[PDB]
Ligand binder design. Structure first.
Ligand SMILES: *[C@@H]1O[C@H](CO[C@@H]2O[C@@H](C)[C@@H](O)[C@@H](O)[C@@H]2O)[C@@H](O[C@@H]2O[C@H](CO)[C@@H](O[C@@H]3O[C@H](CO[C@H]4O[C@H](CO)[C@@H](O)[C@H](O)[C@@H]4O[C@@H]4O[C@H](CO)[C@@H](O[C@@H]5O[C@H](CO)[C@H](O)[C@H](O)[C@H]5O)[C@H](O)[C@H]4NC(C)=O)[C@@H](O)[C@H](O[C@H]4O[C@H](CO)[C@@H](O)[C@H](O)[C@@H]4O)[C@@H]3O)[C@H](O)[C@H]2NC(C)=O)[C@H](O)[C@H]1NC(C)=O
Ligand SMILES: *[C@@H]1O[C@H](CO[C@@H]2O[C@@H](C)[C@@H](O)[C@@H](O)[C@@H]2O)[C@@H](O[C@@H]2O[C@H](CO)[C@@H](O[C@@H]3O[C@H](CO[C@H]4O[C@H](CO)[C@@H](O)[C@H](O)[C@@H]4O[C@@H]4O[C@H](CO)[C@@H](O[C@@H]5O[C@H](CO)[C@H](O)[C@H](O)[C@H]5O)[C@H](O)[C@H]4NC(C)=O)[C@@H](O)[C@H](O[C@H]4O[C@H](CO)[C@@H](O)[C@H](O)[C@@H]4O)[C@@H]3O)[C@H](O)[C@H]2NC(C)=O)[C@H](O)[C@H]1NC(C)=O
Lengths: 207, 13, 208
């Protein structure tokens, strides 16, 4: 029969007041003969009725993909509420249930440190700017770069890595042309996390 | 020349 | 039926001439009624004969785990040779084949640099020493830390991340008591990769 996958909201969505965080219950392998999927959503065991179903989508491998999206409040997700999606279909012996919530455990505040490029690094066309983010829990985080109010998009960030004290760390690497760095421009690493003051901090870096 | 890692031979050219 | 999983050597074993790199063909779900497995091995299509079968291991779920190990030459693996394991068994309408090799693509030399703790970290009981390794291809690599010839084990390394120029990067972070840093100890980041001179480079780091 069908298979169910339940996805959390994006970290950035739960951390910005203006954005709308949602939990997403994806049902793949839905047949053509019995396409009807019934969803029941529960928040800490309490059934809710405001979920919204995406347009049904033909996959062309004999199956439908059926999605139910449940909007969630920022405080609810962050206060660790558990979200259960229950999927029923004629091709299932019994309904499938999945549950998702924020990782449990005391939140810890990220330590954000910007690290200039090595002087041994300076013979290339572009330099590498580093932002170390450590000591954070849970691992849900968003990291970005900007300069003079403008977004700087040429970066890569590593996945969070579990550290020896049970918290997480990552590095983000921004690559910029050597000249811009040499000319004393300020580049900033922006971090969003639940345990930061105002769910936000910024650290800057310059020659 | 050769390279060593914690006393153990790595490679020589 | 039985299933086959074929695993490459450890990067370190392919990179240290004093080590022995090997490829490993694991066959799971071998039945009690037909435990006999035949292995054929191929190097770039040419059959080789020097593989050896590891001791059979019965599993908690009533099946056997049968494993063939093929030793390989450092330079054949590093030159991109392709290793094929072929598995036959009566409970298997047709033999199963798997091939693995080094990722294809011109090798690029890792750029290794160390980075001292931020000034802002100096307030803490412990400080982070950073080793950035970038511009390397392929992604196969080993990164370790040491000081005074002794390994320093309190580190963590990020998995390799694909960069926008098609090379990989990673960071390695060693955590030490602030006092060991203040005491002027030299700490070294060791990188092993095919595209380095003698497969090895070392970058050091101490209080300035
Ligand atoms: C018929 O085809 C379908 C469709 O597949 C596509 O079309 C076919 C023809 C091929 O071309 C495919 O290549 C195409 O994908 C097949 O459906 C697939 O089934 C797979 C297994 O049955 C299933 O695998 C599971 O995937 C999980 C991860 O899914 C992620 O990531 C994949 C790719 O990495 C992506 O394709 C998925 O869509 C999904 O993406 C996430 O979606 C969520 C929800 O939309 C996103 O979150 C939301 O985002 C919005 C804004 O965009 C908003 O912010 C919301 O708040 C937020 O919630 C999220 O961003 C997406 N992430 C990413 C990275 O993209 C795995 O986790 C899972 O593994 C787990 O379970 C396994 C055991 O079961 C374990 O091994 C494992 O460790 C894990 O525990 C599975 O691997 C595929 O997802 C699914 N593909 C799709 C598109 O649904 C079908 O199988 C096939 N049928 C037949 C009979 O052949
Ligand atoms: C009956 O039971 C058996 C055994 O089950 C075990 O015990 C029980 C009690 C449970 O706890 C199990 O979880 C235990 O494994 C079942 O056998 C399992 O079947 C799985 C598939 O059905 C198979 O999954 C595949 O695993 C691949 C990675 O496997 C790694 O890692 C796991 C742990 O992470 C480890 O258990 C495996 O043995 C294997 O470990 C590697 O072994 C190799 C070879 O020995 C090592 O390489 C060598 O190392 C030496 C140093 O000693 C030297 O360096 C050599 O040079 C070098 O070659 C290597 O280091 C080991 N790595 C690690 C980390 O330990 C996955 O990659 C693979 O995924 C792929 O396929 C998927 C789809 O199928 C895709 O999602 C994906 O994209 C990939 O393509 C599979 O998930 C298990 O490995 C296997 N377990 C064992 C022990 O073999 C059996 O299924 C069950 N049967 C029934 C009917 O119920």
């Amino acid at each position: 029969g069908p298979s169910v996958f339940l996805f959390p909201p994006k970290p950035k969505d739960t951390l910005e007041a203006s954005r709308t965080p949602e939990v997403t219950c994806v049902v793949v392998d839905v047949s053509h003969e019995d396409p009807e999927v019934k969803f029941n959503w529960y928040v800490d065991g309490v059934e809710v009725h405001n979920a919204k179903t995406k347009p049904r989508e033909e996959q062309y491998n004999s199956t439908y993909r059926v999605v139910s999206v449940l909007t969630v409040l920022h405080q609810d997700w962050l206060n660790g509420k558990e979200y259960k999606c229950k999927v029923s279909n004629k091709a299932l012996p019994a309904p499938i249930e999945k549950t998702i919530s924020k990782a449990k455990g005391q939140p810890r505040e990220p330590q954000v440190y910007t690290l200039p490029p090595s002087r041994e690094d300076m013979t290339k066309n572009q330099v590498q700017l580093t932002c170390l983010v450590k000591g954070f829990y849970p691992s849900d985080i968003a990291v970005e770069w900007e300069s003079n109010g403008q977004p700087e998009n040429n970066y890569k960030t590593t996945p969070p890595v579990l550290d020896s004290d049970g918290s997480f760390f990552l590095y983000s690497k921004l690559t910029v042309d050597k000249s811009r760095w040499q000319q004393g421009n300020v580049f900033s690493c922006s971090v969003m996390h639940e345990a930061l003051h105002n769910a936000y901090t910024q650290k800057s870096l310059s020659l | 020349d050769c390279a060593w890692h914690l006393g153990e031979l790595v490679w020589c050219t």
